[PDB]
Structure 1
Amino acid sequence: SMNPPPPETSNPNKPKRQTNQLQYLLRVVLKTLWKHQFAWPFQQPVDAVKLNLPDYYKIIKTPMDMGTIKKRLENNYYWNAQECIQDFNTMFTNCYIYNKPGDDIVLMAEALEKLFLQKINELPTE
């Protein structure tokens, strides 16, 4: 019924490092996906109450969204680019699990994922 709290985005106990791949994930990948025409349902956690999707968090137990990824990148929450890439993949997979193939939101996520993969293919070395 109710929304869960959003995913955690900061942890002062976790170690921190800035890498060129994490910098690319924020300044290129996140920035580019955020401005896509289809980004807005993915810019914040799914509000299943407001969207009237009462079973959403009965089905989706690893919610993820780009608003959370943006804060995680800003707060140096990730040690590895791969952790951030996994969050993007979780966001897309969540949409494909909850929604019927071919639904409007699924086509929107598919377009975002294609652009994501294009940018991930140009992830710099190190």
Structure 2
Amino acid sequence: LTFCEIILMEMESHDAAWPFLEPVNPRLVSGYRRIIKNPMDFSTMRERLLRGGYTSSEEFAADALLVFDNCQTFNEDDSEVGKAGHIMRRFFESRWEEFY
């Protein structure tokens, strides 16, 4: 869970991390409530981590991949959020496989 802190901090401070810092506001994003069943962002993961709500690193990795799966589900690959999402997803997978 130490590395979970390291990689979350690096993700939170990443350049392309702007679409995933805060939860998506369904009032502002049309159809998001309908398309995405399990919304997830970095702050939600951050709150769960500080509270200690992560049993294992796998549960952490699950929510991380959930962020990028949700991004790919709702946004186009050539969209601004989509392009930022591909950067963040590749960043996570890379750093995650470095440690483990």
Name the structure 2 match of 1:107: 83
Q: What letter matches 1:47 in structure 2? A: N
Name the structure 2 match of 1:15: none
CA distance in 2, matches of 1:117, 1:75: 24
Task: Find the structure with the greater CA-based Rg.
Answer: 1
Name the structure 1 match of 2:3: 24
Length-normalised TM-score, structure 2: 0.93
Counterpart check, 1:122 vs 2:98: yes
CA distance in 2, matches of 1:40, 1:101: 16
Displaced runs of 4 or more, over 2 A: none
CA distance in 1, matches of 2:2, 2:51: 12
Please state whether the residue corresponding to 1:41 is helix, strand or coil: coil
CA distance in 1, matches of 2:45, 2:99: 17
CA distance in 1, matches of 2:30, 2:75: 13
Deviation, structure 1 residue 123: 2.3
Alignment counterpart, residue 17 of structure 2, candidates 2, 18, 39: 39
CA distance in 1, matches of 2:25, 2:67: 14
Deviation, structure 1 residue 71: 1.0
User: Alignment identity in percent?
Assistant: 28
1:1-126 maps to which residues of 2 (within 5 A)? 22-26=1-5, 28-49=6-27, 52-123=28-99
Which stretches in structure 2 are left out of the alignment for 5+ residues? none
What is the total number of aligned residue pairs between the two structures?
Answer: 100
Which stretches in structure 1 are left out of the alignment for 5+ residues? 1-21
Please state whether the residue corresponding to 1:25 is helix, strand or coil: helix
Q: Which has the higher helix share?
A: 2
Name the structure 2 match of 1:14: none
Q: RMSD across aligned C-alpha pairs, in angstroms?
A: 1.1
Length-normalised TM-score, structure 1: 0.75
Per-residue deviation, residues 28-73 of structure 1 (Å, max 9, x unmatched): 1001111111112201110122xx3221011101000000111111
